Structure formats: C-alpha cells, structure tokens
C-alpha cells in the first residue's frame, strides 16, 4: 500500500518499496513524443526505469488516479539509457481534447491529496511529471 | 518569423505615469508569457512581472508590485506596461519577451528596448 | 529567498583565435526533472539580450559551435573557442529554476591587444 504526503499543501509525494517521486504539474515539457518513450500499456513502461519499483509505483499511480490505459492518452518517459534519470509526464491540460481526461484526473488527484489545489486551470498548458525524489523527513512512514 | 516591436522613447516628469507597448507576430501571442525586463544605464537585468494574454493571469517581482500594471490586447496582439509614480530610478531601458517552456523555462525572442527618460 | 547569481569574472580581455571561460555560481540549485534550469545571453551594446544558451547546454537558434554551455547544480560555464571579433559583448547568465527571475551581473568580454 503506497504512502501519500501533501508538505505545504503545495508539494506532493508517493512512496511505496524502494521507490518515492515527487508528483509537480507546470508548464515546462520536460519530455517531447518525438525524442522520448511514448507509454499506451503498463508493458511500455519497462524501457522507462531499471527499477521495477518505479515502475510498479508509476503504474499504481496511474491506476489510482483513474487514467484507462486502453481508452486514455498516452504519456511519456524518459528512455532509462538515457543519463539524465527517471521521469514520466502527463498531459493534465484543461483544454481541447484533453479537457474531458483533465477534468477525471482532477477528480483522481482530489480523491488521492485532498489538501491539494488544483494548478491546471481552464485553457493552461499544465504538464505533470513524476520524479525521483528522497522521501522528506516531515512526512510519515505508515 | 517571431518579432516583438516596441514602443519608442518616452519622457516623463517625475511623478508622471507612463504606458508601453510590445507588438507581437509570428507566433499565436495567447499561447505564452510575455515577460518584462528592466535595465538601468550600464547596469544588469531585473525581471519584473509577466501576463498571459489567454486569460489575462500576471505574475510580479515583489519589488515592482505597486510600480508596475502589465495588461493586453489579444484582438491586436499587444502587451502594456504602465510604469506609475515616476522617479530617477525608473529612467532605464525595459524589455518585452517571450518566454518559452519546451525543455527549459527560457526568454527565446525579445523586443528591441523602449527607453524611458525620467526628467523635469 | 532570491535566488543570487555571481559571474565571474567581470571582465575579461581574450586574444583572437583563443578560449574565452565565463563562470556562474548560483546560491542554490537550479536543477529539476534532470536538468538544469541555467540559460545565457549575449548583449551588445544598443541591442536586446539574445539567447545563446538554455538549460545549460543546449544551443540557441542560430548559435554557432564555438558557443558552448555546460555544468549543473550551482556551478556552470560559458566556453567560446575560438574567440571572434563579433564575440565582444556583455555576457549574462540567467537561472529560471525559482520565480523571481534572476541574472548575473554580467561579464565584459574583449579583444586582447
């Protein structure tokens, strides 16, 4: 059972085995389709982390918060060869053809950190990443 | 291709207020922060605050908050900034730019400068 | 709370054909997402500032070879080699890690004579 914590009511984190992330949303695409690892099924992952804790972590995320692999848009990892280390980002925008997916992971993220006010407003690029991260003193560990 | 046109010189008297324009094309203006710069007679860059014309947000340095009004006009393509309660310490070149966010966070395109001369 | 930025040096004269080496220390890190968020700028005088580098190693548009970033965390470099005449310019650094924006304040390069 993976370990949710909101510090500030503003950053937040998951933990669970050997794996923690810091889970932020703004406007900077770290990742592009075009250069880095488009994810449709939890199997995609595997070229994402040598850590199957990570990938375990990421996939109960997603799950959590309500992202429908079949029907839902892809999103995007970094390629684990790469140096640069572990990252997935989803495109949490609230505007277009994504508004509808937006408006469940809303909901999804609402339900997971209550405390947490929602960054992605109407018609902002607003891009998800999750990072490794060190779990913070301040949060518990059950 | 992207180009940013300022407005010319202005004077003011101290005291005065003063509006500024920047002029964009090339790109969709509603889709990015336009940024403003300040830089005083051979000195460095101070940012001051940014708008985003889509929906009118704005962010500003807390030391030009009170100082500075940015605003725009999405049917013109064009960011204002009103400098208000002028003093010698305003006289300075400022800047508009575009700020970009596809792998990085980074001012890409800038105007050409207005320079403000404050004076009796 | 300000992230600060200090150059160095504040000048420097470089003969033509030799390596010119601007430093940038920031007052924390500006690294996030594996990257970092440093960028650099090229100002002559009368001109806006033009983007030479961002997140500190990738090239700006049009930005010849002998422009190169590099570094991470707080310590980053601007290497130009071979030194140009057209390189004379005010060079600053920039972290976009932490709003307020910041700069250093600038490094004079020259023509060594």
């Known amino acids: 059972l993976p370990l949710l914590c909101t510090l500030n009511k503003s950053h937040l984190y998951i933990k669970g085995g050997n794996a923690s992330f810091q889970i932020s949303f703004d406007d900077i695409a770290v990742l592009l389709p075009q250069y880095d690892v488009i994810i449709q099924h939890p199997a995609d992952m595997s070229w994402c982390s040598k850590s199957d804790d990570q990938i375990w972590l990421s996939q109960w995320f997603m799950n959590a918060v309500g992202h429908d692999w079949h029907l839902d848009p892809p999103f995007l990892c970094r390629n684990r060869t790469k140096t640069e280390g572990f990252i997935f980002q989803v495109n949490t925008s609230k505007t277009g053809v994504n508004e509808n997916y937006a408006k469940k992971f809303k909901t999804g993220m609402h339900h997971l950190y209550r405390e947490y006010p929602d960054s992605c407003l109407n018609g902002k690029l607003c891009l998800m990443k999750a990072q490794p991260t060190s779990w913070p003193l301040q949060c518990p560990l059950d | 291709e992207v180009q940013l046109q300022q407005s010319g010189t202005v004077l003011a008297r101290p005291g005065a207020s003063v509006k500024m324009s920047c002029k964009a094309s090339?790109?969709?203006?509603?889709?990015?922060?336009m940024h403003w710069i300040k830089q005083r007679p051979g000195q460095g860059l101070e940012w001051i605050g940014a708008?985003?014309?889509?929906?009118?947000?704005?962010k500003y340095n807390q030391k030009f908050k009170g100082k500075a009004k940015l605003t725009a006009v999405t049917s013109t393509s064009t960011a204002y900034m009103e400098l208000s309660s002028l003093t010698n310490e305003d006289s300075a070149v400022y800047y508009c730019?575009?700020?970009?966010?596809?792998?990085?966070?980074?001012?890409?395109?800038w105007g050409q400068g207005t320079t403000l001369t404050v004076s009796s | 709370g300000d992230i600060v930025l200090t150059q160095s040096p504040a000048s420097l004269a470089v003969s033509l054909g030799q390596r010119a080496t601007i430093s940038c220390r920031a007052s924390?890190?500006?690294?996030?997402?594996?990257?970092?968020?440093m960028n650099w700028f090229q100002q002559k005088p009368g001109q806006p500032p033009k983007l030479l580098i961002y997140?500190?190693?990738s090239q700006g548009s049009g930005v010849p070879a002998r422009f190169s970033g590099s570094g991470s965390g707080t310590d980053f470099s601007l290497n130009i080699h071979p030194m140009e005449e057209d390189d004379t310019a005010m060079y600053f650094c920039?972290?976009?890690?932490?709003?307020?924006?910041?700069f250093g304040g600038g490094t004079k390069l020259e023509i060594k004579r």
């Open positions: 730019t575009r700020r970009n966010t596809l792998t990085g966070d980074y001012f890409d395109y």
């Open positions: 090339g790109y969709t203006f509603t889709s990015y922060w």
């Open positions: 708008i985003y014309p889509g929906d009118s947000d704005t």
């Open positions: 924390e890190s500006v690294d996030d997402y594996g990257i970092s968020f």
């Open positions: 997140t500190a190693s």
């Open positions: 920039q972290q976009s890690k932490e709003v307020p924006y910041t």
